[PDB]
Write an enzyme that holds these catalytic residues in place. Structure first.
Site, short mmCIF file in Angstrom:
data_model
loop_
_atom_site.label_atom_id
_atom_site.label_comp_id
_atom_site.label_asym_id
_atom_site.label_seq_id
_atom_site.Cartn_x
_atom_site.Cartn_y
_atom_site.Cartn_z
N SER A 52 35.61 60.19 17.28
CA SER A 52 36.52 60.98 16.41
C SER A 52 35.78 62.19 15.88
O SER A 52 36.31 63.24 15.53
CB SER A 52 37.10 60.22 15.20
OG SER A 52 38.22 59.51 15.67
C1 LIG Z 1 38.12 58.08 15.90
O1 LIG Z 1 37.01 57.59 16.12
C2 LIG Z 1 39.35 57.24 15.81
N1 LIG Z 1 38.99 55.96 16.40
C3 LIG Z 1 39.78 55.30 17.24
O2 LIG Z 1 40.89 55.71 17.56
C4 LIG Z 1 39.26 54.03 17.84
C5 LIG Z 1 39.15 52.72 17.32
C6 LIG Z 1 39.54 52.20 16.09
C7 LIG Z 1 38.78 51.20 15.52
C8 LIG Z 1 39.12 50.63 14.29
C9 LIG Z 1 40.24 51.08 13.62
C10 LIG Z 1 41.01 52.08 14.19
C11 LIG Z 1 40.67 52.64 15.42
N2 LIG Z 1 38.57 51.95 18.29
O3 LIG Z 1 38.29 52.77 19.44
C12 LIG Z 1 38.69 54.04 19.20
C13 LIG Z 1 38.48 55.08 20.27
C14 LIG Z 1 39.75 57.19 14.33
N3 LIG Z 1 38.59 57.53 13.53
C15 LIG Z 1 37.92 56.36 13.00
C16 LIG Z 1 36.79 56.65 12.03
O4 LIG Z 1 35.86 55.81 11.96
O5 LIG Z 1 36.81 57.71 11.36
C17 LIG Z 1 39.06 55.48 12.48
C18 LIG Z 1 38.56 54.05 12.31
C19 LIG Z 1 39.63 55.96 11.14
S1 LIG Z 1 40.31 55.61 13.76
#
Ligand SMILES: *C(=O)[C@@H](NC(=O)c1c(-c2ccccc2)noc1C)[C@@H]1N[C@@H](C(=O)O)C(C)(C)S1
Length: 246
Positions: A52
């Site tokens: 992210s």
């Molecule tokens: C970016 O890293 C996003 N992550 C995801 O979409 C993601 C997750 C996930 C894990 C746990 C909860 C939600 C999503 N698992 O694999 C992927 C590719 C978003 N950003 C993150 C961050 O840590 O800032 C989240 C957890 C807010 S989702």
């Protein structure tokens, strides 16, 4: 994949206790002294899906492509219900970044040309530059970057060495500003990725800008579970207080 550099660094081995439970790394760059400090150098060169934290550059790209304008960052929520409530509404750059709303950035990517993007990643040296894997190449897919490269890019962006507009950079920086004091500006972005149904890729990247310096950093976590952006930020915040920056 591995980032190759024979840059000099101060060893930060006594950060090891902060990474209990993890194969983790911490890279700091001290702008004034022009000096890296690293916990776990081998792990600091391993390339992982930036997840992210890629949103930062996806944003700079959308700006540069006049897909985003300074007073036009708003996107319509298409009404899909997500597991996290903050995502279930209209977004602008700031909220999309604060709540890490994937769809905002998936819309940005959807409207950029893959080749314009390839060209950008070549210019900015974004890790392995592999965007071949899937549509969401930045999510536990083909695109991988090392903690040390995460720091080099933030530094390059902030020292205006990327061919992005200064106000674009200002906007993007504002959207990831976590704290703004007299004595410092604290900027950062988290990242979580799941593999084998577990949180196994944790990022926290950013920088602290004081009145006479800027300390860029990246913390990365790898582990069986609980390797996430939140933990990575918690670890980074402890480390940064202990160096007396936050
Ligand atoms: C970016 O890293 C996003 N992550 C995801 O979409 C993601 C997750 C996930 C894990 C746990 C909860 C939600 C999503 N698992 O694999 C992927 C590719 C978003 N950003 C993150 C961050 O840590 O800032 C989240 C957890 C807010 S989702």
């Amino acid at each position: 994949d591995k980032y190759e550099t024979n840059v000099s660094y101060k060893k930060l081995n006594q950060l090891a206790p902060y990474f209990k439970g993890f194969d983790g790394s911490f890279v700091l760059y001290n702008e004034r002294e022009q000096a890296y400090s690293i916990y776990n150098e081998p792990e600091s060169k391993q390339r992982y899906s930036p997840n992210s934290t890629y949103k930062i550059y996806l944003a700079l790209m959308a700006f540069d492509q006049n897909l985003l304008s300074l007073n036009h960052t708003e996107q319509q929520w298409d009404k899909h219900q997500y597991p996290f409530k903050e995502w279930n509404q209209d977004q602008n750059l700031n909220s999309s970044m604060k709540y890490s709303v994937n769809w905002y950035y998936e819309n940005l990517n959807k409207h950029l040309r893959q080749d314009e993007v390839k060209s950008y990643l070549d210019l900015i040296e974004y890790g392995n530059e592999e965007i071949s894997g899937n549509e969401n190449y930045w999510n536990e897919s083909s695109l991988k970057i090392s903690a040390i490269e995460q720091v080099n890019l933030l530094k390059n962006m902030k020292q205006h060495n990327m061919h992005f507009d200064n106000k674009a950079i200002e906007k993007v920086e504002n959207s990831m500003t976590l704290k703004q004091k007299d004595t410092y500006k604290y900027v950062g972005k988290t990242g979580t990725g799941i593999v084998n149904h577990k949180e196994a890729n944790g990022w926290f990247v950013g920088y602290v800008e004081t009145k006479d310096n800027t300390y860029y950093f990246a913390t990365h976590l790898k582990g069986e579970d609980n390797a996430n952006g939140e933990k990575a930020q918690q670890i980074s915040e402890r480390i940064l207080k202990e160096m007396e920056l936050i």
